[PDB]
């Protein structure tokens, strides 16, 4: 009926690290090849969370662009093509300049 | 050097389900317990992603509120206290209005 999440278990996942984030696919962010693509959103490892001391930003150190297979709904002929998004590798807590 | 992601693996994590999402701790969401809460953000299971059809929205079926141990920076005496947040259990795709 009830569970108390330990503070250690709280901050471990809260710290600035690479994590799975849903990214909505738009005509502005990744362009137009068809009217709409399926799925209309994807998941990539991004730098999320928060630093212990206020005054330190959560920013990526290294990043690599990954390519994913996406279903492109085109009217001449619908095809399963390829797309690309920028994915983060590792993050660090740097002081906010 | 790089590698491709299979479309099955693309949509599986992209489909509407419960997933780990970072939530920034704000005074608008949780009131005065400290000037700064540590960590300043936490992680809860939330309904993210997108449904296959355009007229289908991603909404939670049922939710259970979980409580987490949080360090409250109080200048009279700093204490490791307790706070609560709403967390989803399962999600579904419904037609829109």
């Amino acid at each position, epitope marked *: 009926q009830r569970k108390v999440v330990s503070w250690i278990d709280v901050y471990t996942r809260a710290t600035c690290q690479p994590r799975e984030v849903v990214v909505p696919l738009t005509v502005e962010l990744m362009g137009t090849v068809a009217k709409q693509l399926v799925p209309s959103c994807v998941t990539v490892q991004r730098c999320g969370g928060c630093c212990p001391d206020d005054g330190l930003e959560c920013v990526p150190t290294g990043q690599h662009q990954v390519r994913m297979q996406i279903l492109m709904i085109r009217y001449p002929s619908s095809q399963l093509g390829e797309m690309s998004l920028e994915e983060h590798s590792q993050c660090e807590c*740097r*002081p906010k300049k | 050097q790089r590698k491709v992601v299979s479309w099955i693996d693309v949509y599986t994590r992209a489909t509407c389900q419960p997933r780990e999402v970072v939530v920034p701790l704000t005074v608008e969401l949780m009131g005065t317990v400290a000037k700064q809460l540590v960590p300043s953000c936490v992680t809860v299971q939330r309904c993210g992603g997108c449904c296959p059809d355009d007229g289908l929205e991603c909404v939670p079926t049922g939710q259970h509120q979980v409580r987490m141990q949080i360090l409250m920076i109080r200048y009279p005496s*700093s204490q490791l206290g307790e706070m609560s947040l709403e967390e989803h259990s399962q999600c579904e795709c419904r037609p829109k209005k």
Partner: antibody
Amino acid sequence: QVQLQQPGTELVKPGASVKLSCKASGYTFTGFWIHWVKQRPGQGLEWIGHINPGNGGTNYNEKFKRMATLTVDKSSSTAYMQLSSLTSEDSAVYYCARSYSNYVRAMDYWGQGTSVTVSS
Amino acid sequence: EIQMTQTTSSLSASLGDRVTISCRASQDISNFLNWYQQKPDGTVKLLIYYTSTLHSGVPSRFSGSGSGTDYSLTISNLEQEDIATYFCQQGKTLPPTFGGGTKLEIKR
């Protein structure tokens, strides 16, 4: 999967200095304080100093006032301890552990240790 | 430096006994105490890190108690796991001060 690495054995001569290693692997290194603790054979734990690899802010114990120097490396993810001018009294096992916040001071994960022997 | 004091060091008890290890501080640390477990091979792990809050992978036998100047680590059921020296460390202010490691032998 989260752990700290310390070379178990370390040999030096009286007068010499050691650069002890604390290789961190399994977590975001620059988000946790790295503490260093001294322990004599069958004695209590003595806090030497802690270092924040995130900003570079350091703190040393008063009695180790000139004798520990703490450094960090963002590449390779390793924390260091520079024990300047060693004597026979400094022959002890040195640990490295990590805590999270400024207020709690709770080091959750420790290293295996570094048994520093000095004799020549 | 706050002189964190452990009155007892030599301790021996039979299996399945309520074993209590206490600590006394020089001043009020406001519930900021952490109990550590140093195994015979020198490996140190964190058992209870507040008043009574458990670290990941620690049996419910270890119970944390004490509110102010007086705190105690209480093992509800003693086994053969639980052969180690137990330290308490204050977290009120720097430095972080450790007490005298109480050796826990088991009676047979």
